[model samples]
Target: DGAHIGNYQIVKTLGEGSFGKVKLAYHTTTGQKVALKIINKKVLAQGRIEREISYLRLLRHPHIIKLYDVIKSKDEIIMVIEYAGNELFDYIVQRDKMSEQEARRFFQQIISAVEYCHRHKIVHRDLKPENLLLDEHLNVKIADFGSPNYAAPEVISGKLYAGPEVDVWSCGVILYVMLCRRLPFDDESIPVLFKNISNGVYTLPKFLSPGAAGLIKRMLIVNPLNRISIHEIMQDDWFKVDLPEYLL
Candidate 1:
């Protein structure tokens, strides 16, 4: 965060995702840490700018990425948000398989944020470990829409509805990755990956807690309507233990 971008000063680059490049920065006036999510005008495609302002701007929660400001220049859109550190995918990989309790801690944060979104009648349309960012305190900051690796069957079959169930389905994939250290429906061939997700073909590790595996099963159901909802997930025994009360 040495250089200046608008009123903020940049420390360095965090990396990239569907939202575009994230640069670690500091607010000039407040001297507070922030991340500049730089999206190009060419990438904005017009309607996207409206979507972020009219809707995304309204979303705020403990686990969700906070949008401080959305500034537009002639050819760029910059989103000022909390400076949460690296993505969760590499974090999971660094530590073989995460313990169930550790997985539950983060999964709770994910659902809590997603549930908040659904209550606002918004569907995230994007969910995965890569978007689950970790702050300096290691708190979860849910942030995406990319990669069919975490996509639900309905999405793969082109019989999709704009619904929260798909996010739940993606969350299921994340849970599996956390507890199993692998993906449930991953293949080198895109076509084969589609068939696997469409057929809901995957195996839960016998070592996984029955409660955790059960929740994953419900969330991963091939039929969107049959899949678990955030409402039901909160009450799940696996998700309920030692959960923070504010999320409820």
Candidate 2:
């Protein structure tokens, strides 16, 4: 959405997705820095990262990473997004993990974004450290939505489009991972992780604070229908605390 075409002076490679590479690019005209995701048309024809771009374009929120523009060249799809500084997972893990109070603050930020997604009827089927980013000020931005599903309001009609419910379940997984510095549903492989999650077999760490433990049980419910709704989650007592206050 700015003054530029295929001639961005790439500053550095950020990371690669399954079908494209993310790069730090600078516009020659305005000198503005941006994160550019370059997707190959061959892959887009196969419907891989092309869907990622489509989903991102439909989503817009402050807490959710903002997609600036999408452009197409002879053979590539380029996405310009706001540059977010760090991975949320590593930031929490490297800081020796979060205290409950700190975690509450972070969760509030994340939930605010999730709530926005819920209102828009988008489900982030994948919510994890690798998918979440943070700015230098610790502002959270959920950027990746390649694995997303969208639904009309009210999934009660047996219309099985993915909705905010799956997003909430993924948030439970994210929470457990952030708290223990490991995936709560961890296993030898991803399939195993899915199996455990499907069967509700993962054991929560015994060390969680009582309030935190209760919240996890509610969120990590195996039957997506049974998980707490986002409205209920935000209204839960744990989400209402001021800084430095934790469940004891």
Candidate 3:
């Protein structure tokens, strides 16, 4: 099949999104692999799509998903993003439990990327394992900008956009899942899940090192004001160990 969209040719279909398909594609001229997020203009003419695009344009980090180009047509918006085919969610599912050394490596990349976002006044409202991708080298690449399960209490209680601290809370949840191999907050009922988040309730595995456990508690604070800032994480004892010099 020889299908072309703008300057890119469709390689294959990736997956479904809210109003479109994430098709694997490559630049016709450069021949570099990319993911074209093709969305129907009629179904989602603007709003969220535009805002996410705006943020993607502003972000440039080694650990962040790069949005190289945007192709527009009569009824479609094609977001040409970097090709990072591996999903962090699947990586977690395929393993029993990630080693803290491995988890820390992943966490630092994520934290460094997140810290970069905060510096630019952008909050990745979504910080789930699903939204966190892995490039061919298996390094972190954060995509999408929106989640609720790994949400902070303020987010659960109804604050529209509290700020960067909310991301810290979600990052905490992600770290916990990486270390514990499960979600920090879960329940059959939506109300109960919300309650659990508000109470900042979760059982920390005794297996976790005190340094790791201590950091989680700081990040998962019920009040956003008291939560650890990304800057603080950069200096955190647990986070600083073996941090790549380039990240600094």
- The lDDT per prediction is 0.82, 0.69, 0.86
Least accurate stretch of 10 residues (summed lDDT) in model 3? Answer: 37-46
Clashing residue pair totals per candidate (backbone < 3 A): 4, 0, 0
Clashing residue pairs for model 2: none
Model 3 TM-score is 0.90
As for candidate 1, its clashing pairs are 1-10, 1-11, 1-12, 2-10
Mind sharing the TM-score for model 2?
0.76
Better of 1 and 2 by lDDT: 1
Give the candidate number with the greatest TM-score.
3
Report the C-alpha lDDT of model 1 over 70-104, residue by residue, as the tens digit: 88878677888767668887788787777899999
The top-ranked prediction according to lDDT is: 3
Give the clash total for candidate 2: 0
Ranking by lDDT: 3, 1, 2
lDDT, candidate 2, 61-109, per-residue tens: 6678877788877877778887877888678767776778777777777
Judge candidate 1 at residue 13 and give its lDDT. 87
Candidate achieving higher lDDT, 1 or 3: 3
Candidate 3's displacement at residue 50, Å, is 1.8
Candidate 3 stretches greater than 4 Å from native: 5-7, 16-19, 28-31, 43-45, 159-161
